[PDB]
Amino acid sequence: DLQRLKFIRHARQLGFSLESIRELLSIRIDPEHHTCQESKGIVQERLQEVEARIAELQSMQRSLQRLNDACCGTAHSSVYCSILEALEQG
Amino acid sequence: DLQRLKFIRHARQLGFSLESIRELLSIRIDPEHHTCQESKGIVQERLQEVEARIAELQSMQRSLQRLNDACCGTAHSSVYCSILEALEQG
Ligand SMILES: [Zn+2]
Ligand SMILES: [Zn+2]
Ligand SMILES: [Zn+2]
Ligand SMILES: [Zn+2]
Numbered sequence: 001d002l003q004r005l006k007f008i009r010h011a012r013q014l015g016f017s018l019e020s021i022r023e024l025l026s027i028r029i030d031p032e033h034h035t036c037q038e039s040k041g042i043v044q045e046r047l048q049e050v051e052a053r054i055a056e057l058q059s060m061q062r063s064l065q066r067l068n069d070a071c072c073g074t075a076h077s078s079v080y081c082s083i084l085e086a087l088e089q090g
Numbered sequence: 091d092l093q094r095l096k097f098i099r100h101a102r103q104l105g106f107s108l109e110s111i112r113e114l115l116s117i118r119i120d121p122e123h124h125t126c127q128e129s130k131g132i133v134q135e136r137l138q139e140v141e142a143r144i145a146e147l148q149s150m151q152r153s154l155q156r157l158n159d160a161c162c163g164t165a166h167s168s169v170y171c172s173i174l175e176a177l178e179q180g
Contacts, residue, residue, distance in 0.1 A: 007177050013180070015150050036164055036166040036173070037163050037166075040161045044158055050150055057140055057147070060104050060140055064136060065137065071130045071133070072130075074127055076126040078126060078128065079122055084118055087101055087114065
């Protein structure tokens with residue numbers, strides 16, 4: 001029951017890079033020589049990384065939604081498929 | 091100017107796996123023997139993959155937002171930092 005393992009798992013579940021986690025463990029073991037500025041910087045970095053991803057994934061999701069909704073999804077010959085036509089224009 | 095290269099790039103920008111792209115190129119080269127059901131299935135699979143990711147990334151973003159907002163981010167000794175306390179409870 002080494003408590004820092006739970007700490008690490010939680011940082012992991014938040015998608016912190018191994019390098020960021022090393023920094024956090026460094027702060028955790030010696031708090032008297034680190035500040036809120038350092039720990040917050042690590043969080044802001046990870047937060048910006050996540051928000052940028054979510055944005056580029058939602059862009060894809062919107063395009064994928066249009067592609068999905070326009071196709072009939074039946075035995076209709078793919079010779080007429082809008083999905084292939086769309087991927088052609090991009 | 092081999093047009094299928096543009097096709098591939100567009101599928102790439104949508105985050106389709108290499109295997110899905112192989113399937114699309116197979117449909118593209120021989121449309122007379124494939125249907126909208128096949129091409130749509132490939133799109134739905136990718137769409138569900140993206141929506142699940144966006145959901146797990148937004149979960150992180152919400153937690154990261156709370157962590158970020160609660161910390162003063164100044165020289166305040168990390169001995170009092172809420173970020174480390176939070177990562178402790180998870
Ligand atoms: Zn159709
Ligand atoms: Zn179709
Ligand atoms: Zn503080
Ligand atoms: Zn703090």
